[PDB]
Design a binder for this molecule. Sequence first.
Ligand SMILES: *[C@@H]1O[C@H](CO)[C@@H](O[C@@H]2O[C@H](CO)[C@@H](O)[C@H](O)[C@H]2NC(C)=O)[C@H](O)[C@H]1NC(C)=O
Lengths: 49, 77, 49
Amino acid sequence: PAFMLGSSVGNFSDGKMGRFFNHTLVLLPDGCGTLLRAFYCILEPRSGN
Amino acid sequence: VDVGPDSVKSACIEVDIQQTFFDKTWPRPIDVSKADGIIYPQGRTYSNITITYQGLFPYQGDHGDMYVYSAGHATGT
Amino acid sequence: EDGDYYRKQLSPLEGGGWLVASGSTVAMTEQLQMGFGITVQYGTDTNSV
Ligand SMILES: *[C@@H]1O[C@H](CO)[C@@H](O[C@@H]2O[C@H](CO)[C@@H](O)[C@H](O)[C@H]2NC(C)=O)[C@H](O)[C@H]1NC(C)=O
C-alpha cells in the first residue's frame, strides 16, 4: 500500500476534506512488489481535468 | 535538494468514488498470542525467557481499518 | 520585525479557530554565537559511535 503523512490538513476546492500543507511524506510501491520509493517532499496539485 | 521528472500534461485519468462496492467484509482481528504484527525489542535480544516490556502496541482483538484495492472499468482490451 | 503577531485560521479537523504567535528579534553580537545541544543514546541500536 501507499501511505501519505503530514501535519496540516485542509479541505479541497469543492469542500471535501483532503488537502494537507507544508512539508509531507509519501511512500510508493512499484516493480510489481519490490520498489519502495519513499520521500518527504512537497506536493503541488495539478489543475487539469 | 532533489531531482526528479514530471509525467504528463495536466489531465488526470477519471477517478470515481464507488466505496459502496468496496464496503464488504473479511473480518480478521489481531492476536498477540499468534504474535500478529508486534514490534520486537529494538535495543537488545534475549533467549528462552519471558520478560515484561513497555512498548507501542495495538489493543488485542481490534478489528482495524481493513481496506482493499481493485482495478477500474474496462471493455475488452 | 520585533513584536510581530502571526495568526492563521484553522479547520474543524483540528478544531477550527486560529493559531497565533508573537515574536521578537535580537540583533548581532560582534562574535556571532551558536547554541549546540548534544544527546547520546545508549542501547537503542548497534553501539557504533
Ligand atoms: C528453555 O527453557 C525451558 C524451561 O525451563 C527448558 O526446559 C526445561 O529444561 C530442564 C533442564 O533440566 C528440564 O529439567 C525440564 O524438564 C525442561 N522443561 C520441559 C517442559 O521440558 C529448556 O531446556 C530451555 N532451553 C534451553 C536451550 O536452555
